[model samples]
Target: ANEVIKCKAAVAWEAGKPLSIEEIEVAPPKAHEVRIKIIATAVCHTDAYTLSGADPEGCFPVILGHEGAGIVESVGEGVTKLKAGDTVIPLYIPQCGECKFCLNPKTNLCQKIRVTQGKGLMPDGTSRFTCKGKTILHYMGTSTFSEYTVVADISVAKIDPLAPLDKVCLLGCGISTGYGAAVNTAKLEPGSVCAVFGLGGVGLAVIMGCKVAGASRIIGVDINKDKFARAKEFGATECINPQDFSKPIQEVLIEMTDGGVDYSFECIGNVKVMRAALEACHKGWGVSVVVGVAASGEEIATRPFQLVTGRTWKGTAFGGWKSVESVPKLVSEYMSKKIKVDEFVTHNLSFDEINKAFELMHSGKSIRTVVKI
Candidate 1:
């Protein structure tokens, strides 16, 4: 075991306030835990959501970041799969192989770490970080905003050493969530028609997944026409600027597909757009997946007739992919050129420029921002 390390981290002390860089102490890994020296972390919308008081279970004064890549610095006792110097990705949802969900084949939701993770602590209900002798709550179990992070062995997925750590870090969350939504959660088939009602990083990844799934017509709808060019590059066969359409988006989508698309995804986290996604799906097999995180106390409404007509509404957090089992495989796919993880990162910033990166994200100028820690 190594000695405790002093590191810098971008921490959110309170909701609806900007993050601050502060010095924190990181302890060595405990049993079944691994310490990672994070090289890079991506600023996902979720990070901003929790900071802005949008996350229902968000905690304060915590290091914030769930998606990142780094090298294993040390492993706790009983750890055998990973060693020091191994490249890996951090996962918010850990996969404890003995959990009920892990043993069940029908679902990807693992409950092993559910209780403590929601409370911003380790599985043992404790934190490994401290600031001036005060304990700091961990965020999403990974908390990769810090230069070094302590995570469960089950939460770190090994990646190829050759893959660029900074670029592939996006796969830890945004990329994997969207890609898995279409490929694994929805199980999209060839010749199917799909529509994504947002052109952000997640929506673009959904379009890419549709392309890989062999969808015949993949439509991208957004108010921002600027995103159209990148949407096409990610495999959107058609682009729709909602502001330009005279009729309701649901009507427009039905008219375009001669009825409706086989699948639709809501990536904006707006209740209105969520409704439109549900209404745009074809009857008798159309599935709509909601992947966005809406603000607290927000609710979405839909007529029961929509479901009675054979339309199914589903929601995904982390794309229903078990992180430990799926992240490594996803990384392997990226290494094999089967998917486009590198193209998702549109901006790269240093850890000091995190505030500016969030500004760009709010202004819709960047899709995903990678922070070099």
Candidate 2:
């Protein structure tokens, strides 16, 4: 017999509205899917952006969390990789092995359901959640705000059952996104110099990744002075409060490193900051990675000479992580101390206080806020 569980979920009823915690019914896993009892989820800026209508592809009446860790409740037919009692992370990208992008080896942006997933539906063109007998949309293909969610088996990565769920939950999104920006996208070489704009969760993860990559100098740039201390703890060799610098940030960066940094990352999603990151690169062979989602309808401007002079501009979504291959390695790094997972979660809030977590993130008072379910 099939069972339906009633669970509390933070739902985005409409664009530009606060998420409401409602008791919703979650269906059990269907074919090639697994139902997971989510233990914790983290509030990401992307969630806030979608809530505020900043996301061009945002959908309303959706469950709005992407970063989540949980224990498997049940598995559907044909699902062999994960079973009940497995600890796993909900992956927004479903790594269907047969997809072109999955097999490309150069990119992890799986194209299996790229069109429909962006429209907030499962690859089968259906949703697994309902409220008051009405359908609720999924977000990022992972409606993790709900206590228990049914996701494709390919979209869930099994992790160490012994690892603390509260801490490792962060690896689902922010940590992986930031770390991948540095290690995978930029491929920071040993002794290379790098600067990260915005010391939020993603930015701090970039710092940790840069450290792990053996960067000689990892500089953190942010207007918030409070983040400086936390940034250093993550591995920043120097902290720059943009307000304290007289010249333009690019000029200041060039002066600090004597020739600008080998790499720069803009995690704030501000067009101006994006330009600053591009300009704050070494004369030749400099790379700039944009990990933030800029506002809708906004454009970033830069001189063509900037790129012609050997600086490369690139963008990373989901940290270029292939759900099946990369996520496990990231989890292993978390368990082995190669990546600083605990320091990234600066705030933990109850599901009821999820809004407060967003407020803390908006005020720059927290790096990552975990919503304990």
Candidate 3:
């Protein structure tokens, strides 16, 4: 643990290019940090979005995968929450309970390392990964694309040993974000009717949470017909294609639901769809939650009257889950079959096939692809 370890990692040398699998050096963790041996990671659109050179915060020459599960390989001095061999998940949104945001309980955006993390550096404003003697930046602080990564202790969550890393790895991002948006952010009431605005992994997960919360009708909306079947399998009562209707989707939804759904979610990360999701909510008490991450600099708009009437418009980050605290419980829920994580996983690829995982996601052929590293 005292010496640097060499391992395989998918290095994104630049934006708008394929990752190169290369042997890289991972240095030991510093004080209040932990070194992790990433066992499995799942690719999401966010990675692809950044790689497309679309993300304003995107940086070059970095390791990019964020959703992952792993074992704690070593703990830096003064670290107490984790140790060698502990099964864990790395959190992009860390929970340092001492921070003001963490102490507020209303938000989970830990600011302790935000500036450095956004700059693709570690808490100490440097990187642990090096390839060919040149520094490689960390992505989202997790950088699970590497076989071994170092992160702050507060950014790691210890999970049940019995939990399978390959399956629960999704909790690092998409699954927990959608699931908790329904259960925690929305606090969905029993018998409520809901609508999910996209049929991607996160959208299906929101439907799952709606079903678990006893939502009477879970409607799934998507432009693609192929995603409909899987949405149904995840508890969507009916699926609709926005293109099928001549009128605006919001108007169509309003007519069919007798006014609007009790709760609506936008998981597509499109500002237009975000507006539709908000407008599709029931007039008086409807709640619309934006679970998607829109492009940087894009903004949402609607008649201020939409808010004046009574609908509540809100958005979530990491599904409003306190990463360190909620992830382990979510892992247990997955273990007990209370949450349907396995249904979200559509492909399994070896770390060598990591590029294909990105390809599958880009072609809309996979929901979640776990890459064994």
Candidate 4:
């Protein structure tokens, strides 16, 4: 990513085409690699973004997936952290603990395998998958679309065997991104007012964290009315449908909050939404956290006056998770009933229903679709 276990996987044959379910061969784990049989995996917005051909780095014949929970089946030489039968979740942001970002404790972007991963190869500069004599590329290093996958030993997080793989799988990406944005990055205060733009899975997770943090008011903004109910359930004190308001959401929120929210989060990955999020923060000491990843070449902008007036804008990746360490904690949180994951999963699916899983997300009908492999 490890090599010929023929397994059913959803393959992104090319940029423009939909991911098709196919049987492909997975190789054994190489040095410092681990092979796992995925039990359940969740589809994320980033998957659609890349598969839509909008990503500049998007390539062909790749298996595009990252959020997953699986069981370790084999381990290569020097794999000391994990072994056979371990319940694990693999990181797209692989943690080589000694790397600069991992050591810094301030960033989650581990670069240990960045170059090779971005090139769609293993650290050895090759792929472990093949279908019909054609080499299949790896996507984002994790590539859990396969029933079986090879991941670097450093990238996998060992979880409790008692944890539910179906639910905790969300912790791998979406839940972590949103939940961490509030508690880890923004660190919303107990009495702070929080606004989350885009009440999708990630946005709702942000609201969950804010509520758990004892936020006084949690505002959820979305154009879809269907999302509001779930948002409220997850601790949103108020829900707003942007389409129902004539003015910009930023202006509407600012007016509703006396001035602006103490903390604001943007999860849509839209540049325009990012600008709105920054503008919606309270002027004096407001903090706006950008959890979204804008598309390639897209830019976010706001009036200089907005920032000059005392607003601070910051960006977070993977919700500042400590790569390997944070994952286990998140899983433990879910296991202990301290955080929720099952509510985000609106639909459970099989491998053949994966395309519909993506459709459910695009239609705003499902918060998350978990595919059982």
Best model per TM-score: 3
Candidates in order, TM-scores: namely 0.97, 0.97, 0.99, 0.98
What does candidate 2's lDDT look like per residue over 40-83, in tens digits? 99988888888888777887789988999999999888888888
TM-score of candidate 4 versus the correct structure, residues matched by position: 0.98
Local accuracy of candidate 3 as per-residue lDDT tens digits, 175-284: 99999899989999999999999899999999999999999999999999999999999999999999999999999999989999999999999999999999999998
Per residue, candidate 4 scores C-alpha lDDT tens digits across 290-348 of: 99888888988988888889899998889889868989989999988899998899999
Local lDDT at 301 for model 2 = 92
lDDT (C-alpha) at residue 335 in model 4: 85
Q: What is the lDDT of candidate 4?
A: 0.90
- The stretch of ten residues in a row with the least summed lDDT in candidate 3 is 1-10
Runs in model 3 deviating more than 4 A are: none
- Give the local distance difference test score of model 3: 0.93
lDDT of each: 0.89, 0.88, 0.93, 0.90
Off by over 4 Å in 4: 1-3
For candidate 2, the C-alpha RMSD (Å) to the true structure equals 1.3
Of models 2 and 3, which has the larger TM-score?
Answer: 3
